[PDB]
Every structure is written in structure tokens, then in C-alpha cells.
Design a protein around this ligand. Structure first.
Ligand SMILES: Cc1cc(-c2ccc(/N=N/c3ccc4c(S(=O)(=O)O)cc(S(=O)(=O)O)c(N)c4c3O)c(C)c2)ccc1/N=N/c1ccc2c(S(=O)(=O)O)cc(S(=O)(=O)O)c(N)c2c1O
Ligand SMILES: Cc1cc(-c2ccc(/N=N/c3ccc4c(S(=O)(=O)O)cc(S(=O)(=O)O)c(N)c4c3O)c(C)c2)ccc1/N=N/c1ccc2c(S(=O)(=O)O)cc(S(=O)(=O)O)c(N)c2c1O
Ligand SMILES: Cc1cc(-c2ccc(/N=N/c3ccc4c(S(=O)(=O)O)cc(S(=O)(=O)O)c(N)c4c3O)c(C)c2)ccc1/N=N/c1ccc2c(S(=O)(=O)O)cc(S(=O)(=O)O)c(N)c2c1O
Ligand SMILES: Cc1cc(-c2ccc(/N=N/c3ccc4c(S(=O)(=O)O)cc(S(=O)(=O)O)c(N)c4c3O)c(C)c2)ccc1/N=N/c1ccc2c(S(=O)(=O)O)cc(S(=O)(=O)O)c(N)c2c1O
Ligand SMILES: Cc1cc(-c2ccc(/N=N/c3ccc4c(S(=O)(=O)O)cc(S(=O)(=O)O)c(N)c4c3O)c(C)c2)ccc1/N=N/c1ccc2c(S(=O)(=O)O)cc(S(=O)(=O)O)c(N)c2c1O
Ligand SMILES: Cc1cc(-c2ccc(/N=N/c3ccc4c(S(=O)(=O)O)cc(S(=O)(=O)O)c(N)c4c3O)c(C)c2)ccc1/N=N/c1ccc2c(S(=O)(=O)O)cc(S(=O)(=O)O)c(N)c2c1O
Ligand SMILES: Cc1cc(-c2ccc(/N=N/c3ccc4c(S(=O)(=O)O)cc(S(=O)(=O)O)c(N)c4c3O)c(C)c2)ccc1/N=N/c1ccc2c(S(=O)(=O)O)cc(S(=O)(=O)O)c(N)c2c1O
Ligand SMILES: Cc1cc(-c2ccc(/N=N/c3ccc4c(S(=O)(=O)O)cc(S(=O)(=O)O)c(N)c4c3O)c(C)c2)ccc1/N=N/c1ccc2c(S(=O)(=O)O)cc(S(=O)(=O)O)c(N)c2c1O
Ligand SMILES: Cc1cc(-c2ccc(/N=N/c3ccc4c(S(=O)(=O)O)cc(S(=O)(=O)O)c(N)c4c3O)c(C)c2)ccc1/N=N/c1ccc2c(S(=O)(=O)O)cc(S(=O)(=O)O)c(N)c2c1O
Ligand SMILES: Cc1cc(-c2ccc(/N=N/c3ccc4c(S(=O)(=O)O)cc(S(=O)(=O)O)c(N)c4c3O)c(C)c2)ccc1/N=N/c1ccc2c(S(=O)(=O)O)cc(S(=O)(=O)O)c(N)c2c1O
Ligand SMILES: Cc1cc(-c2ccc(/N=N/c3ccc4c(S(=O)(=O)O)cc(S(=O)(=O)O)c(N)c4c3O)c(C)c2)ccc1/N=N/c1ccc2c(S(=O)(=O)O)cc(S(=O)(=O)O)c(N)c2c1O
Lengths: 58, 58, 58, 58, 58, 58, 58, 58
């Protein structure tokens, strides 16, 4: 019962970022800026890769 | 009972970002800016890759 | 019962960041800026790779 | 019952960061700036790789 | 008399070759197979980048 | 008389070769297989980057 | 008379070769297989970077 | 008369070769297999970086 399982895989990626200026200003919240070539696999779990989750209150 | 399973896979990607200026200003909330070549596979789970989830209140 | 399992894998990545200036200013919250070639696999667990999770209150 | 298990693996990565100036200013919160070629595998555990988790209060 | 001169330049390239098998058989001649991101600039010269130049005779 | 001269330049390149098998068989000639990120600048000269130049005779 | 001269330059390169098998068989000629990130600048000279130059005779 | 001269330069290179088997068989000729991050600058000279130059005769 031979079973192969290629899951949550990422291969053969090539990004090129040319940026003269890159700022992230944050006042009161969350920021999630740059993600590249990210992989995940959960079992009885909750995956949440890029989750900027803000709560401003008073 | 040989079963192959190629799931949640990402391969052969090539992005090129040329940006003279890139700003993200945040006041009170959330931001999720740049995601590229991201993969996921959950089992009994809730996947949520890029979720900027704000709550401004008073 | 020979089973192979290639899960949560990341291979063959090549990023190139050319940036003249890159600032992250943070006042009251969270920031998660640069992630590249990150992998994960949980079992009875909750994976959460890049999670800037802010709570501004009073 | 020969089972191979390549999980949470990261191989063949080559990043190149050219940055003339890179600042991270933090006032009251959290910051998580640069992650590259990071791998994880938990069993009965909660993986959380890059989690800038802020709580500003009064 | 300020003169800028961006000549013979190549920047921001990202190729991705996925090939299961790649053969080059040569019997009597020339072959020039793979060129990528190549640049040149001659002055009183003859540029000739990829020149497979065969002469079969008797 | 300030003159800048960016010539014969190559920057920001990222190739990714995934090849299961790659053979070059040569019998009587020339072969020039893999060139990547190559640069040149001659003055009173003849540039010739990849030149497989065969002469089969008798 | 301030003159800058960025010539024959190569910077910011990142190649990734994954090859299960790579053979070069040569019988009677020349072979030039793998060149990467090579730079040159001649003055009263003849540049010739990858030149497999065969002469089979009798 | 301040003149800067960045010529024949190579910087910021990162190659990664993963090869299960790599053979070069040579019978009667020349072979030039692996060159990476090579630089040159001649004045009244002839540069010739990778030149497999064969002469089979009788
Ligand atoms: C993209 C880019 C931006 C800037 C630059 C310049 C100024 C600046 N802000 N300045 C401020 C700000 C505020 C001021 C304020 S306030 O806001 O009220 O507080 C007040 C006052 S005042 O009351 O005293 O009047 C000021 N004076 C303020 C002020 O001066 C900022 C933010 C940015 C400069 C240069 C620039 N880019 N340069 C170029 C220029 C050339 C580039 C060239 S080339 O040489 O032309 O071939 C090529 C290339 S490429 O090959 O890579 O494509 C480039 N990328 C080139 C390039 O990027
Ligand atoms: C990367 C880069 C940054 C900037 C730049 C310049 C200034 C600056 N802010 N300055 C400020 C700020 C505030 C001031 C204020 S305030 O706001 O009230 O506080 C007041 C006053 S005042 O009342 O006294 O008037 C000021 N004077 C203020 C002021 O001066 C900042 C923030 C940034 C300019 C240029 C620049 N890039 N340069 C170039 C320029 C050239 C580049 C060239 S080339 O030589 O042209 O060929 C090539 C290449 S490439 O090969 O890599 O493509 C480049 N990348 C080049 C390049 O990047
Ligand atoms: C950077 C920057 C910041 C602010 C700023 C400063 C103070 C401030 N006050 N905070 C308050 C105050 C009161 C609060 C009160 S109250 O008193 O009862 O009313 C209550 C409550 S509560 O109930 O929630 O408890 C609060 N939370 C209150 C509160 O948070 C706040 C809110 C903000 C403002 C402006 C600012 N400017 N940023 C700059 C500044 C400069 C920039 C420049 S320069 O070179 O300097 O010219 C250039 C450039 S660009 O050309 O590149 O785009 C920029 N983008 C620049 C830039 O972005
Ligand atoms: C950097 C910077 C910071 C701020 C700043 C300063 C103070 C400040 N005060 N905080 C307060 C105060 C009071 C609070 C009160 S109260 O007293 O009862 O009213 C109550 C309450 S509560 O009830 O919630 O408990 C609060 N939370 C209060 C509170 O949070 C805060 C909130 C913020 C403001 C501005 C600022 N400027 N930054 C600059 C400054 C300069 C920048 C320049 S330059 O070169 O210098 O020209 C350039 C550039 S750019 O071209 O590259 O974009 C910039 N972006 C620059 C820039 O961003
Ligand atoms: C760096 C920097 C800092 C601040 C700054 C300073 C003090 C300050 N005061 N704190 C307060 C005060 C009161 C609080 C009060 S209250 O009194 O009841 O109201 C209550 C409460 S509470 O209820 O929460 O307990 C608080 N937490 C309060 C509080 O935190 C705060 C909040 C902030 C401000 C500005 C600032 N500037 N930064 C600089 C400064 C300079 C920068 C320069 S320069 O070369 O110097 O020109 C250049 C450049 S760039 O060109 O490269 O972008 C910059 N970015 C520069 C830059 O970013
Ligand atoms: C020359 C030659 C080549 C091969 C052969 C077969 C398969 C193969 N690839 N294998 C696979 C397979 C699976 C892959 C999987 S999976 O399915 O999920 O697990 C995934 C992935 S991936 O994740 O990376 O996408 C892969 N890349 C996989 C993959 O590459 C490769 C690269 C090469 C096989 C044989 C071969 N030549 N054999 C010869 C050759 C000659 C033979 C000759 S003769 O000399 O020509 O007369 C005679 C005789 S006989 O008379 O005795 O019958 C023979 N038996 C001869 C003979 O056997
Ligand atoms: C690889 C291969 C080679 C040849 C082959 C062998 C000998 C040969 N003889 N040479 C002669 C002979 C005489 C000359 C004469 S004469 O005697 O007066 O007439 C004169 C003159 S002259 O006047 O110019 O001086 C000559 N030059 C003469 C000359 O050059 C020559 C010319 C060629 C033949 C076939 C051959 N097969 N190749 C293979 C062989 C096998 C291949 C296989 S397998 O696994 O092995 O089954 C598979 C596969 S694939 O499925 O992947 O496509 C392949 N492609 C395979 C493959 O390509
Ligand atoms: C590898 C291979 C080589 C040749 C081969 C062998 C001998 C040979 N003889 N040369 C001669 C001979 C005589 C000359 C004469 S004469 O005696 O007066 O007539 C005169 C003159 S002259 O007047 O010009 O001076 C000459 N030049 C002569 C000459 O050049 C030559 C030219 C070539 C032939 C075949 C060959 N087989 N290779 C194989 C063999 C096997 C291959 C296999 S396998 O696994 O083994 O099944 C598989 C595969 S694939 O599936 O991957 O494609 C292959 N491609 C395989 C493959 O390519
Ligand atoms: C020349 C030759 C080569 C090989 C051979 C077979 C497999 C192989 N690779 N192995 C694997 C396998 C698994 C990998 C796995 S896994 O599955 O998850 O565990 C993972 C990974 S990864 O993580 O790095 O991606 C791998 N890289 C794995 C991998 O590389 C390599 C590199 C090479 C085998 C044999 C061989 N030649 N053998 C010959 C060769 C010739 C033989 C000849 S003859 O001279 O040609 O006439 C005759 C005869 S006979 O008459 O007695 O039958 C023979 N038996 C001959 C013979 O046996
Ligand atoms: C490797 C290999 C070699 C040859 C081979 C052997 C001898 C040979 N004879 N030479 C001659 C002879 C006579 C000359 C004459 S004459 O006598 O007057 O006619 C004249 C003249 S002259 O006038 O120029 O002076 C000459 N030059 C002559 C000449 O050069 C020559 C020419 C060639 C042949 C085949 C060969 N096979 N190679 C193999 C062999 C095996 C391969 C195998 S295996 O595992 O072993 O099954 C597998 C595989 S693969 O699956 O991975 O593709 C392969 N590719 C294999 C492979 O490539
Ligand atoms: C390794 C190998 C070598 C040769 C081979 C052997 C002898 C030979 N003889 N040379 C001659 C002879 C006579 C000359 C004469 S004459 O006597 O008057 O006729 C005249 C003249 S002249 O007038 O020009 O002066 C000459 N030049 C002559 C000449 O050059 C030559 C030329 C070549 C042949 C085959 C060979 N086999 N190699 C193998 C062998 C095995 C390979 C195997 S295995 O595991 O062993 O199965 C596998 C594999 S693979 O799967 O990985 O591809 C392989 N590729 C293998 C492989 O390549």
C-alpha cells in the first residue's frame, strides 16, 4: 500500500526585489509586510500564516 | 493501493518587483502587504493565509 | 506498506533583495517584516507563522 | 513497513540582501524583522515562528 | 557636461529551468546551448556572444 | 565634466536550475553549455563570450 | 573632472543548481560546461570568456 | 580630477550546487567544467577566462 504524499511543498522559487525605499509606519494596530516561499502543514491544527490582527479600543 | 497526493503545492514561481518607493502607513487597524509563493494544507484545521482583521472601537 | 511523506518542505529558493533604504517604524502595535523560505509541520498543534497581533487599549 | 518522512525541511536556499541602510525603530510594541531559512516540526505542540505580539495598555 | 551612460546593462532577471532530462549530442560541428543574463560592450571591437560556427569538410 | 559610466554591468540575477539528468556528449567539434550572469567590456578588443568553434576536416 | 566608471561589473547573483546526475563526455574536441558570475575588462586586448575551440583533423 | 574606477569587479554572489553525481570523461581534447565568481582586468593584454582549446590530429 505504497502512498506518496507531497503536501504543503514549495520549490523552485526565485524572487527579485529592487526597491529604492521601502518604509512601514505603524501607529496602533498590526502590519505584516513581506512573505515569500512559506509552507505549512497542520494536523488537528489551525494554520494561520500572515495574520495582522489589530484591536484598537478605548 | 498506491495513491500519490500532490496537494497544497507551489513550484516554478519567479516574481520580479521593481518599485522606486513603497510605503505602508497604518493608523488603527491592520495591513497585510506582500505575499508570494505561499502554500498550506490543514486537516481538522482552519487555514487563513493573509487575514488583516481590524477592530476599531470606543 | 512503504509510505513516503514529503510535507512542509521548501527547497530551491533564491531571493535577491536590493534596497537602498528600508525602515520599519513602530509605535504601539506589532510589525512582522521579512520572512523567506520558512517551513512548518505540526501535529495536534496550531501553526502560526507570521502573526503581528496588536492590542492598543486604554 | 519502511516509511520515509521528510517533514519541516528546508534545503537549497540562497538569499542576497544588499541594503544601504536598514533601521527598525520601536516604541511600545514588538517588531520581528528578518527571518530566512527557518524550519520547525512539533508533535502535541503549537508552532509559532515569527510572532510579534504587542499589548499597549493604560 | 555631465553625461550618464547606462549601456550593455542587464539587471533584474530571474529564470527558472525545470527539466527532467536535457541532453546535447554533438558529432562534427558546434553547439551553444544555454545563455542567460549576458552583457557586453565593445569599442573598436566585434562582439559575438553565442556563435556556434561549424566547418565540416573533407 | 562629471561623467558616470555603467557599462557591461549585470546585477540582480537569480536563476534556479532543477534538472534530473543533464548530459553533454561530444564527438569531434565543440560544445558550450551553460553560461549565466556573464559580463564584458573591451576597448580596442574583440569580445566573444560563448563561441563553440568547430573544424572537422580530413 | 570627476568621472566614475562601473564597467565589467557583476553583483547580486544567486544561482541554485539541483541536478541528480550531470555528465560531460568528450571524445575529440572541446567542452565548456558551467560558467556563472564571470566578469572581464580588457584594454588593447581581446576578451574571450567561454570559447570551446575544436580542431579535428587527419 | 578625482576618478573612481570599479572595473572587472564581482561581489555579492551565492551559488548552491546540489549534485548527486557529476562526472567529466575526457578522451582526446579539453574540458572546462565549473567556473563561478571569476574576475579579470588586463591592459595591453588578451583575457581568456575559460578556453578549452582542443587539437586532435594524425
Ligand atoms: C525617489 C527619490 C526621492 C528623493 C527624496 C528627496 C527629498 C525627500 N524629502 N525631502 C523633504 C521632506 C520634507 C520637507 C519638509 S516637511 O515635510 O514639511 O517636514 C519641509 C521642508 S522646507 O520647509 O525646508 O522647505 C523640506 N525641504 C522638506 C524636504 O526637503 C524625500 C522624502 C525623497 C530623492 C531622490 C530620489 N531618487 N533618486 C533617483 C535619481 C536618479 C536615479 C537614476 S539616474 O542617475 O537619473 O539615472 C536611476 C535610477 S535606477 O537605475 O535605479 O532606475 C534611480 N532609482 C534614480 C533615483 O532613485
Ligand atoms: C537613497 C537616496 C536618498 C535621498 C535622500 C536625501 C535627503 C533626505 N532627506 N533630507 C532632509 C530631510 C528633512 C529636512 C528638513 S525637515 O523635514 O523639516 O526635518 C528640513 C531641511 S531644511 O529646512 O534645512 O531645508 C532639510 N534640508 C531636510 C533634508 O535635507 C532623504 C530622507 C533621502 C536622496 C537620494 C537617494 N538616492 N541616491 C541616488 C542617486 C544616484 C544613484 C545612481 S547615479 O550615480 O545617479 O548613476 C545610481 C544608482 S543604482 O546604480 O544603484 O541604480 C542609485 N541607486 C543612485 C541613488 O540611489
Ligand atoms: C509620525 C507622525 C506622528 C503623529 C502623531 C503624534 C502624536 C499623536 N498623539 N497621540 C494621541 C493624542 C491624543 C489622544 C487622545 S486625546 O488627547 O484625549 O484627544 C486620546 C487617546 S485614547 O482615548 O485612545 O486613549 C489617544 N490614543 C490619543 C493619542 O493617541 C498622534 C495620534 C499622532 C502625527 C503625524 C506624524 N507624521 N508623520 C510624518 C512626519 C514626517 C514625514 C516626512 S518629513 O521629512 O519629516 O517632512 C516625510 C514623509 S514622506 O514624504 O516620505 O511621505 C512622511 N510620510 C512623514 C510622516 O509620515
Ligand atoms: C517620531 C514622531 C513621534 C510622534 C509622537 C510623539 C509623542 C506622542 N505622544 N503620545 C501621547 C500624548 C498624549 C496622550 C494623552 S494626553 O496627554 O492626555 O492628551 C493621553 C493618552 S491615553 O489616554 O490613551 O492614555 C495617550 N496615549 C497620549 C499619547 O499616546 C505620540 C503619540 C507620537 C509624533 C510625530 C513623530 N514624527 N516623526 C517624524 C519626524 C521626522 C521625520 C522626518 S525628518 O527628516 O526629521 O524631517 C522625515 C520623515 S520621511 O520623509 O522619511 O517620511 C519622517 N517620516 C519623519 C517622522 O515620521
Ligand atoms: C525618536 C522620537 C521620539 C519621540 C518621543 C519622545 C517622547 C515621547 N513621550 N512619551 C510620552 C509622553 C506623554 C505620555 C503621557 S501624558 O504626559 O499624560 O500625555 C501618558 C502616557 S500613558 O498613559 O500611556 O502612561 C504615555 N505613554 C506618554 C508617553 O509615552 C514620545 C511619546 C515620543 C518623538 C519623536 C521622535 N523622532 N524620531 C526621529 C528623530 C530624528 C530623526 C531624524 S534626524 O536626523 O534627527 O533629523 C531623521 C529621520 S529619517 O530621515 O531617517 O527618517 C528620522 N526618522 C528621525 C526620527 O524618526
Ligand atoms: C536512461 C534511463 C533512465 C531512466 C529514468 C527513469 C525515471 C526517471 N525519473 N524518475 C522519477 C520517478 C518518480 C518521481 C517522482 S514520484 O513518482 O512522486 O515518486 C517525483 C519527482 S519530483 O518531485 O522531483 O517532481 C520525480 N522527479 C520523479 C522522477 O524523476 C529518470 C530520471 C530516469 C530509467 C532507465 C534508463 N535506461 N535504462 C536502460 C537503458 C538501456 C537498456 C538496454 S540498451 O543498451 O538500450 O540496449 C537494454 C536493456 S534489456 O535488454 O536488458 O531489456 C535495458 N534494460 C536497458 C535499460 O534498462
Ligand atoms: C551515438 C551514435 C553514433 C553513431 C556513429 C558511429 C560511427 C560513425 N562512423 N563514422 C564514420 C564512418 C565512415 C566515414 C567515412 S567512410 O568509411 O569512407 O564511408 C568517411 C568519412 S570522411 O570522408 O568525412 O573522412 C567519415 N567522417 C566517416 C565517419 O565519420 C558515425 C558517422 C556515427 C551512429 C548512431 C548513434 N546512435 N546514437 C544513439 C544510440 C543510442 C540511443 C538510445 S539507447 O538507449 O542506446 O537505445 C536512446 C536514445 S533516445 O531515446 O533518448 O532518443 C538515443 N537518442 C540514442 C542515440 O542517439
Ligand atoms: C558512443 C558511440 C560512439 C560511436 C562511435 C564509435 C566509433 C567511431 N569510429 N570512428 C570512425 C571509424 C572509421 C573511420 C574511417 S574508416 O575506418 O576508414 O572507415 C575513416 C575516417 S577518416 O577518413 O575521416 O579519417 C574516420 N574519421 C573514421 C571514424 O571517425 C565513431 C565515428 C563513432 C557510435 C555509437 C555510439 N553509441 N553511443 C550510445 C550507446 C549507448 C547509449 C544508450 S545505452 O544505455 O547504452 O543503451 C542510451 C542512450 S540514450 O537513451 O540516453 O539516448 C544513448 N544515446 C546511447 C548512445 O548514444
Ligand atoms: C550508474 C548507476 C546509478 C544508480 C543510481 C540509482 C539511484 C540513484 N539515486 N538514488 C535515490 C534514491 C532515493 C532518494 C530519495 S528517497 O527515495 O526519499 O529515499 C531522496 C532523495 S533527495 O532527498 O536528495 O531528493 C534522493 N536524492 C534519492 C536518490 O538520489 C543514484 C544517484 C544512482 C544505480 C545503478 C547504477 N548502475 N548500475 C549498473 C551499471 C551497469 C551494469 C551492467 S553494464 O556494465 O552496463 O553491462 C550490467 C549489469 S548486470 O548484467 O549484472 O545485470 C548491472 N547490474 C549493471 C548495473 O547494476
Ligand atoms: C564510451 C564509448 C567509446 C567508444 C569509442 C571507442 C573506440 C573508438 N575507436 N577509435 C577509433 C577507431 C578507428 C579510427 C580510425 S580507423 O581504424 O582507420 O578506421 C582512424 C582514425 S583517424 O584517421 O582520425 O586517425 C581514428 N581517429 C579512429 C578512432 O578514433 C571510438 C571512435 C569510440 C564507442 C562507444 C562508447 N560508448 N559509450 C558509452 C558506454 C556505456 C554507456 C552506458 S552503460 O552503463 O555502459 O550501459 C550508459 C549510458 S547512459 O544511459 O547514461 O546514456 C551511456 N551514455 C554509455 C555510453 O555513452
Ligand atoms: C571507456 C571507453 C573507452 C573506449 C576506447 C578504448 C580504446 C580506444 N582505442 N583507441 C584507438 C584504437 C585504434 C586506433 C587506430 S588502429 O588500431 O589502427 O585502428 C589508429 C588510430 S590513428 O591512426 O588516429 O593514430 C587511433 N587513434 C586509434 C585509437 O585512438 C578508444 C578510441 C576508445 C571505448 C569505450 C569505452 N567505454 N566506456 C564505458 C564503459 C562502461 C560504462 C558504464 S558501465 O557501468 O561499465 O556499464 C556506464 C556508463 S553510463 O551509464 O554512466 O553512461 C558509461 N558511459 C560507460 C562507458 O562510457
Amino acid at each position: 500500500v505504497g502512498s506518496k504524499t507531497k503536501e504543503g511543498v514549495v520549490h523552485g522559487v526565485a524572487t527579485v526585489a529592487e526597491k529604492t525605499k521601502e518604509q512601514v509606519t505603524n501607529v496602533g494596530g498590526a502590519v505584516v509586510t513581506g512573505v515569500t516561499a512559506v509552507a505549512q502543514k497542520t494536523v488537528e491544527g489551525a494554520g494561520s500564516i500572515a495574520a495582522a490582527t489589530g484591536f484598537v479600543k478605548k
